[PDB]
From a paper:
Through an in silico approach to identify new macrodomain-containing proteins in this organism, we identify a protein containing regions of similarity to aprataxin, APLF and PNKP that we call APL (aprataxin/APLF-and-PNKP-like protein). Interestingly, the N- and C-termini of the APL macrodomain align with the C- and N-termini of human macrodomains, respectively, indicating it has undergone a circular permutation during evolution. Structural analysis of this novel macrodomain indicates it has retained the core features of this domain family, including the α-β-α sandwich fold consisting of a six-stranded β-sheet flanked by α-helices.
We were able to obtain the O. sativa macrodomain in a complex with ADP-ribose, further confirming that the canonical mode of interaction with ADP-ribose is also retained. For example, the acidic amino acids D175 (E439 in Dictyostelium) that forms hydrogen bonds with the ADP-ribose ligand, and the aromatic F113 that forms the binding pocket for the distal ribose unit are found in O. sativa Q10MW4 and canonical macrodomains, suggesting that these amino acids will perform the same functions in most macrodomains. Of note, the APL macrodomain in plants is fused to two other DNA repair domains, aprataxin and polynucleotide kinase domains, strongly implying that APL supports DNA repair in plants as well.
Numbering used by the authors: 95 to 296
The structure:
Amino acid sequence: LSDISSRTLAFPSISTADFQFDLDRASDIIVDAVADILQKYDNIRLVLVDLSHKSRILSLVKEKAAKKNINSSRFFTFVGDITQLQSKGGLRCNVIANAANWRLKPGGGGVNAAIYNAAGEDLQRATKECADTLRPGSSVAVPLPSTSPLHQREGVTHIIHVLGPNMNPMRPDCLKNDYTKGSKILHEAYTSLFENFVAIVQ
Ligand SMILES: Nc1ncnc2c1ncn2[C@@H]1O[C@H](COP(=O)(O)OP(=O)(O)OC[C@H]2O[C@H](O)[C@H](O)[C@@H]2O)[C@@H](O)[C@H]1O
């Protein structure tokens, strides 16, 4: 097997800040999507990250993962900045997920701003070579050039942009609390993410 860092994905909670997706529902969906992928693929590790130790989504996911008896060597939560996992967290993760916007543009606050700021213009060049847009519930894997400061400092080799459902009425494709559709699309976003990650590993 390759090194563990090469088989580790760190991801943030998609859709639950700027996109205002309900945390209780999101946490159920995270744990179900994680359980589903770990049932299929060996030798991967998944790490849910959020910036604050008071994170409500981390607390919910921990509770639910314990109830569901998810294998805690293969999935766990971690407090940290997704762009500083090795340097500040002490945890090397080669692949990270981004909660993107549909046009795959930098900025916009949230984790998307942080990732593009850390990665620099290399990520915008590389992303434009892979895809021009995302639709909700889908993702795209982008190899991160070795010249990127994020690669040099944190060992990140790939970023997977993911577009989750949007519940925020001041953002594109707002679902107006259609959580039937919303829940399906967030399930799809996580499965798409995890499948892209597995396709990088194997
Ligand atoms: N540096 C970080 N490290 C780890 N987690 C973070 C970080 N920054 C935020 N989070 C967590 O990341 C999680 C997701 O929060 P969001 O980034 O709003 O994603 P969304 O899918 O709701 O909105 C996407 C839109 O916002 C974007 O700007 C795009 O431009 C889109 O327009 C939360 O748990 C955060 O606490």
